[PDB]
């Protein structure tokens, strides 16, 4: 297979304005949302049809309870952080946990915490330690690292349990997560715009080459964007030189297939 990733996000906001929730939790396999929970619904609900189809009510009832607890725990350590920083008003607190299953068979695990959208605490499962970006984080770190049973737990979960979940979901959503839709590539003029659309997965490689050598460097890349139908689109541009004749060609790579469009 390709590189597949499972990643779960949690957001905590201190003074949510108006109808904004104070706690949100969403799960992703690759680029697809699979499960969601907010402080208003207080339920864990499917966000993909193949998730609702394959997981018994037991699952949703069990994880609903757990997320209610996490809503509490996050509201409490957002308070302790905000006191240590001496920060008034609004601040955010985020958490990302997850796996990656690489094509070659290797894996990666990661668990991170964030404050105001900045790195705050990063876990290293290979050294069983927490990296702190400041001294507020350093204070939290010293307590966490004193409980090595907890650290050993996280290492085991990231390396075995998360990966196991991912394989489980990859099969649930096989018809979606493991399909290939090749890109449609064309070349426009204004600078040559190499434009691709209608492809999945969204991982795509585009570049311009002059006379057989890569432009190193002033290619202008466009972001990979969702089309709204499950496919994606992107582009790359280079300005054409009016002094010299040059063979410009756009190179696209996608799911193991290389493509060349010459001009």
């Amino acid at each position: 297979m390709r590189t597949h990733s499972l990643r779960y996000f949690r957001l905590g906001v201190s003074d949510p304005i108006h109808g904004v929730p104070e706690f949100i939790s969403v799960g992703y396999v690759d680029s697809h949302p699979i499960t969601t929970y907010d402080s208003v619904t207080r339920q864990k609900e499917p966000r993909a049809p193949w998730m609702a189809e394959n997981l018994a009510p037991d699952h949703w009832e069990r994880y609903t309870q757990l997320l209610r607890g996490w809503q509490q725990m996050f509201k409490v350590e957002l308070k302790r952080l905000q006191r240590h920083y001496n920060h008034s008003g609004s601040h955010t607190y985020q958490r990302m946990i997850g796996c990656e299953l690489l094509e070659d068979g290797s894996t990666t695990g990661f668990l991170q915490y964030a404050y105001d959208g900045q790195d705050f605490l990063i876990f290293n499962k290979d050294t069983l330690s927490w990296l702190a970006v400041d001294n507020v984080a350093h204070t939290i770190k010293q307590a966490w690292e004193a409980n090595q049973h907890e650290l050993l737990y996280q290492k085991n979960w990231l390396e075995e349990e998360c990966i196991a979940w991912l394989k489980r979901f990859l099969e649930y959503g096989k018809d979606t997560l493991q399909r290939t839709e090749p890109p449609l590539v064309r070349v426009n003029r204004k600078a040559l715009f190499c434009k691709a659309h209608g492809f999945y997965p969204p991982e795509i490689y585009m570049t311009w080459m002059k006379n057989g050598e890569e432009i190193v460097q002033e290619i202008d890349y466009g972001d990979i964007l969702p089309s709204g139908d499950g496919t994606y689109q992107a582009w790359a541009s280079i300005e054409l030189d009016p002094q010299s004749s040059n063979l410009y060609s756009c190179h696209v790579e996608h799911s193991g297939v290389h493509m060349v469009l010459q001009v």
Partner: antibody
Framework: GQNIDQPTEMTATEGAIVQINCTYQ??????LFWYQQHAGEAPTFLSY??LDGLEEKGRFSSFLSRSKGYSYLLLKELQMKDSASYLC??????????WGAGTKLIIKP | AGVTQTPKFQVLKTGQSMTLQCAQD?????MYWYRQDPGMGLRLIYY???????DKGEVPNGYNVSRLNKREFSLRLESAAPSQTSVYFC??????????????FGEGSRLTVLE
């Protein structure tokens, strides 16, 4: 699964060494706990294993093999006060505890 | 201190109402009610992940619970039955979900139900 197996009763001599086995067949693995329960009393935490290897705490040690799906609690230099029931408990994929039926340790003086 | 549970003993007729009390002063979020029976491992009746929610365990039938606050988690026998004869243990932990956190048990309560 899900299933945890533990011998019903074990007998060993004072001063000797005893090894209480715990084999588990669960849906995922998030850690294995050992508990000590004296007759008439409440269970109290003994040890916790989640990664392969042997962890020592005094006269007691706990070993874990994730691949083989088993753990043992080792008690060295047995004393009469070690006479109790020992409970094995595994946390599954959904962080729920499965409890073994416990093992009653009888110590011959 | 620790985990406090009452009563330690109780005799009940069929089928009588009964409420078991449990309190913890360790500022724990998750609390539990277990029943212990000869020949089998502990069985969860009900649990409470945190101060504002509870849920069924493995053997919820014939029971109900109330997480009154962060400290108190009460078990309730609706109508006593001979099969409910058991030792009941209250327990609490820092967090029921992710973690290496262990359980802290209460002294236990022996209920005997007779005709």
């Amino acid at each position: 699964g899900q299933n945890i197996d533990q011998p019903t009763e074990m007998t060993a001599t004072e001063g000797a060494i005893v090894q209480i086995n715990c084999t588990y067949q669960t849906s995922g693995f998030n850690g294995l706990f050992w508990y000590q329960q004296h007759a008439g009393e409440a269970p109290t935490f003994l040890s916790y294993n989640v990664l392969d290897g042997l962890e020592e705490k005094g006269r007691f040690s706990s070993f874990l093999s994730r691949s083989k799906g088993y753990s043992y609690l080792l008690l060295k230099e047995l004393q009469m006060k070690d006479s109790a029931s020992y409970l094995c408990a595994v946390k599954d994929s959904n962080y729920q505890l499965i409890w073994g039926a416990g093992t009653k340790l009888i110590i011959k003086p | 201190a620790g985990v406090t549970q009452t009563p330690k003993f109780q005799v009940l007729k069929t089928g009588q109402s009964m409420t078991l009390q449990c309190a913890q002063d360790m500022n724990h979020n998750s609390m539990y009610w277990y029943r212990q029976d000869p020949g089998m491992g502990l069985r969860l009746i009900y649990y409470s992940a945190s101060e504002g929610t509870t849920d069924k365990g493995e053997v919820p039938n014939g029971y109900n619970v109330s997480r009154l606050n962060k400290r108190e988690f009460s078990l309730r026998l609706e109508s006593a039955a001979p099969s409910q004869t058991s030792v009941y243990f209250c327990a609490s932990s820092v967090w029921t979900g992710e973690g290496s956190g262990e359980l802290f048990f209460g002294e236990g309560s022996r209920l005997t139900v007779l005709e």
